[PDB]
Amino acid sequence: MIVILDNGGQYVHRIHRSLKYIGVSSKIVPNTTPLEEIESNKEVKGIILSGGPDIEKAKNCIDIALNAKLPILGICLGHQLIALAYGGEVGRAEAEEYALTKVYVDKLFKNVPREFNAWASHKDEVKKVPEGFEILAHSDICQVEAMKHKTKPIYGVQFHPEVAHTEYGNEILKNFCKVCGYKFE
Numbered sequence: 593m594i595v596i597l598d599n600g601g602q603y604v605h606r607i608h609r610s611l612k613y614i615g616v617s618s619k620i621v622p623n624t625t626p627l628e629e630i631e632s633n634k635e636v637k638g639i640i641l642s643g644g645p646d647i648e649k650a651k652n653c654i655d656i657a658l659n660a661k662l663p664i665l666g667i668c669l670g671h672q673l674i675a676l677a678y679g680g681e682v683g684r685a686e687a688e689e690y691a692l693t694k695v696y697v698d699k700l701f702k703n704v705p706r707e708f709n710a711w712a713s714h715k716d717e718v719k720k721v722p723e724g725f726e727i728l729a730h731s732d733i734c735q736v737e738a739m740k741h742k743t744k745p746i747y748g749v750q751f752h753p754e755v756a757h758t759e760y761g762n763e764i765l766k767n768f769c770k771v772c773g774y775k776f777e
Contacts, residue, residue, distance in 0.1 A: 594618040595619060597656065623644070638665070639663065643752065657746065695709075699727075
């Protein structure tokens, strides 16, 4: 089971519907869900922090990003929240509207080409990557399209892998799920 923190965005049900596509069970919980509740359910093998319009209403994800023992994928707001949580920096970015963005893989991306089109907003972006993290990908307009913690199973993506408009979206979700112990036969 994967747990999805609902940070309020339009694409949270889509996360559940894409994980289903690749045969991964998931459930949406409100983003005020204490970390203890999530980890007491031993079926939960990973966490997704969803997209969301307001970082100041998703403060509890910072607690989850720092303290969880399970793997974490942050998506857009969630990517920014992981960055903030380890003492990285977030700021206004280049363009608010969801658009197709060419992403360059600089190093999650098993079975994915070096360039691919991703569905992304750039209202906000990680300005400073925290200690213990490294950039996995970038676009022309965004230095940090994806990142991961070097030793902890924690991943962020500025773009929405759950949206069909993202090429290899389900492959990216599936690579995350493999880290969460999921077998794909």
